[PDB]
Design a protein around this ligand. Structure first.
Ligand SMILES: O=C(O)C[C@@](O)(CC(=O)NCCC[C@@H](NC(=O)C[C@@](O)(CC(=O)O)C(=O)O)C(=O)O)C(=O)O
Ligand SMILES: [Fe+3]
Ligand SMILES: [Zn+2]
Ligand SMILES: [Zn+2]
Ligand SMILES: [Zn+2]
Ligand SMILES: [Zn+2]
Length: 288
């Protein structure tokens, strides 16, 4: 037997050539596998299978939950006897050793990665599986759709945007170095957050997700906003209190009718080729 050496975030990992059983510890690595018609046996899916977007979910089929992304359950991982574990370079720094005792571990950008880096992690997975060819063609299909949709989005690009989650209790802004933000940058948009106001702002779980006081909100006064939510009725008790707040009402985007509410699973959690493809289709349909 032999190996394929692959550069992960730490350094060169030795992945078995025959790698058949894969545990993945972020949704985005589950999207990468699906796009190479490879199906993992384990997913850290927060116990919530529906957080795996539709085209991925049905292309993966039936798998085993290894628990939360934040705290993957090591005995369920072990029992699955994976030939390879794809872990997040941010989320799982602390279980990296204990993952390697189970199986050779590829630590990659996901949670703290912007749009390009997540795509870089996809290429790394494809090389590790020896599917470079499929990988390039899928990306070539990807680079086409995205740019196609980019040419059809009828929003004016000069109206700066703030993408945010209203966390519980929020707000969390997604800057230019978040997945959403850069993806919007790649589509032509300018983040309302300047690459200098973000200087401070505390981070959420070490990722590019930045706590904003309602007064930071008013100061930057974005011209467009994109609020990511998990509520099917796009309601949220949390968000409705923000909409009553006098200082929210005075925002430029609120007053010029340019607030779009979208699905957080799809926009923020997924971080895959398919999910960006839905994000860009949406934005064409929202542009009208
Ligand atoms: O999860 C992602 O990949 C990305 C992202 O964390 C990005 C984001 O803007 N985060 C704001 C969420 C703040 C919110 N916390 C949760 O809801 C729990 C959790 O975040 C846990 C986790 O992630 O381990 C979860 O997602 O289940 C709170 O209560 O204040 C996101 O959730 O959209
Ligand atoms: Fe989260
Ligand atoms: Zn402030
Ligand atoms: Zn101020
Ligand atoms: Zn609701
Ligand atoms: Zn809620």
């Amino acid at each position: 037997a032999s190996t394929i050496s692959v550069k992960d975030e730490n350094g060169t990992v030795k992945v078995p050539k025959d790698a058949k059983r894969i545990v993945v510890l972020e949704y985005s690595f589950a999207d990468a596998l699906a796009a190479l018609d490879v199906k993992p046996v384990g997913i850290a899916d927060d116990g919530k299978k529906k957080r795996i977007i539709k085209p991925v979910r049905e292309k993966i089929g039936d798998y085993t939950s290894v628990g939360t992304r934040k705290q993957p359950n090591l005995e369920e991982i072990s029992k699955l006897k994976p030939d390879l574990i794809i872990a997040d370079s941010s989320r799982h720094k602390g279980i990296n050793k204990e993952l390697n005792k189970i199986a050779p571990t590829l630590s990659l950008k996901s949670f703290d990665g912007d749009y390009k880096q997540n795509i870089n992690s996809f290429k790394t997975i494809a090389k590790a599986l020896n599917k470079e060819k499929e990988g390039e063609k899928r990306l070539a299909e990807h680079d086409k759709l995205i740019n196609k949709y980019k040419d059809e989005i009828k929003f004016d690009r000069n109206q700066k945007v703030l993408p945010a989650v209203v966390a519980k209790a929020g707000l969390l802004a997604h800057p230019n170095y978040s997945y959403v933000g850069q993806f919007l940058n790649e589509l032509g948009f300018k983040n309302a957050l300047s690459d200098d106001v973000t200087k401070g702002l505390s981070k959420y779980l070490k990722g590019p997700y930045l706590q904003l006081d309602t007064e930071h909100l008013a100061d930057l006064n974005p011209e467009r906003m994109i609020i990511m939510t998990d509520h099917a009725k796009k309601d949220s008790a949390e968000f409705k209190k923000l909409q009553e707040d006098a200082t929210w009402k005075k925002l430029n985007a609120v007053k010029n009718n340019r607030v779009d509410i979208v699905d957080r699973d799809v926009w923020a959690r997924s971080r895959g080729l398919i999910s960006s493809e839905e994000m860009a289709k949406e934005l064409v349909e929202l542009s009208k």
